[PDB]
């Protein structure tokens, strides 16, 4: 009851204190001046950077969630359009998030929570993009094709905007991205 | 003279494929040349001006491959390049996963982000000229050839992230696939 109040406004404060600070120079101090209570408010729930950051990610995996139970269409076409419109237009506006997420992911092979993490992540976004391909090939909509080579694929387009919008220091990246993943997918399904 | 250099690039790749970039230091590297810390320094003050050299050594091999590839057919030339870019990597894969790691410095420093960005100039220039070359020879659909050739960068740099973060090498397999299938869906 109170204990998710606390999370939420914690997980707030994270998202804040990384939006100003970058992974690296992130501290339970910086989040704890994000947060407005005492460093040990914070250390109540984490022990550590690490483990505020792992729950950090369910965190932002769950708002993705959330987002993607508001999209109830079922039409194959209209709904894929959707998640990719989710997965590549909505992030050009969490820029500076993005650097963040990049130092993270750069750091995976060291740490297993943030691995783990990171392939949750990419697990849901994957059955939710075969789950769509394979119901519009039931439906007849779409050819019948490889499912899970036709959204790998997806995943590597998406993955790659997301590097190299940050790379680049270019949101542009995401949007060329998101044309891709349309002529892609249209090659492969219609 | 720049025979000494090349022996510490070689240091720093073996210290940078044990230790990792984050934990790198030039006590380090000093330890994989076996000369002391002021000999590395005599030819590099920072680290990061150490770094910075480190980087665009690689991305100076890589060049000294591709400009190995002497084809002009068009069909022929794309398909090496998209194997030099995405099939040999999976045989070296070590450094990648440092690769990756300076790579998300780049938003920390310059001197990191205008290597990336002239590498991917660079990369960009040779994919599109073939792609241009087969538009002239007939042999591939006038196409929009800045966006198909970024189209593959894309491809290309979501499989080198890919393939560390998810750690599977297979990663830039799909990739090469996922390549061919947009190239020649744009272009054939
Ligand atoms: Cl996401």
Redesign the interface.
Same mark, same amino acid.
């Given at each position: 009851r109170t204990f998710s109040d606390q999370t939420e406004e914690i997980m707030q404060a994270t998202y804040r204190a990384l939006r100003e600070h970058?992974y690296?120079d992130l501290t339970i101090q910086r989040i704890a001046d994000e947060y407005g209570k005492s460093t040990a408010a914070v250390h109540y729930y984490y022990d550590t950077k690490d483990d505020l950051l792992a729950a950090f990610l369910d965190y932002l995996l769950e708002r993705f969630v959330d987002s993607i139970h508001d999209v109830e269409t079922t039409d194959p076409e209209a709904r894929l359009n959707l998640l990719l419109d989710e997965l590549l237009v909505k992030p050009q506006e969490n820029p500076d998030l993005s650097?963040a997420l990049?130092?993270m @992911? &750069?750091?995976?092979?060291?740490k297993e929570a943030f &691995?783990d993490r990171? @392939?949750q992540n990419?697990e849901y976004v994957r059955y939710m993009l075969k789950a769509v391909i394979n119901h519009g090939i039931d439906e007849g909509v779409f050819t019948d094709v490889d499912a899970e080579?036709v959204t790998? &694929?997806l995943?590597?387009?998406?993955?790659?905007? @997301? *590097? @190299?919008a940050?790379?680049?220091?270019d949101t542009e990246?995401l949007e060329?991205?998101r044309? *891709?993943a349309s002529?892609?997918a249209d090659?492969?399904l219609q």
């Amino acid at each position: 009851r109170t204990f998710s109040d606390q999370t939420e406004e914690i997980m707030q404060a994270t998202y804040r204190a990384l939006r100003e600070h970058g992974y690296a120079d992130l501290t339970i101090q910086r989040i704890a001046d994000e947060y407005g209570k005492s460093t040990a408010a914070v250390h109540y729930y984490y022990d550590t950077k690490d483990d505020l950051l792992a729950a950090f990610l369910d965190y932002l995996l769950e708002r993705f969630v959330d987002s993607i139970h508001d999209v109830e269409t079922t039409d194959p076409e209209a709904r894929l359009n959707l998640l990719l419109d989710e997965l590549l237009v909505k992030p050009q506006e969490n820029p500076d998030l993005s650097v963040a997420l990049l130092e993270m @992911r &750069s750091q995976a092979p060291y740490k297993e929570a943030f &691995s783990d993490r990171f @392939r949750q992540n990419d697990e849901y976004v994957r059955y939710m993009l075969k789950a769509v391909i394979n119901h519009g090939i039931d439906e007849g909509v779409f050819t019948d094709v490889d499912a899970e080579h036709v959204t790998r &694929s997806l995943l590597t387009i998406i993955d790659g905007a @997301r *590097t @190299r919008a940050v790379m680049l220091d270019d949101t542009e990246e995401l949007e060329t991205a998101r044309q *891709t993943a349309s002529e892609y997918a249209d090659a492969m399904l219609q």
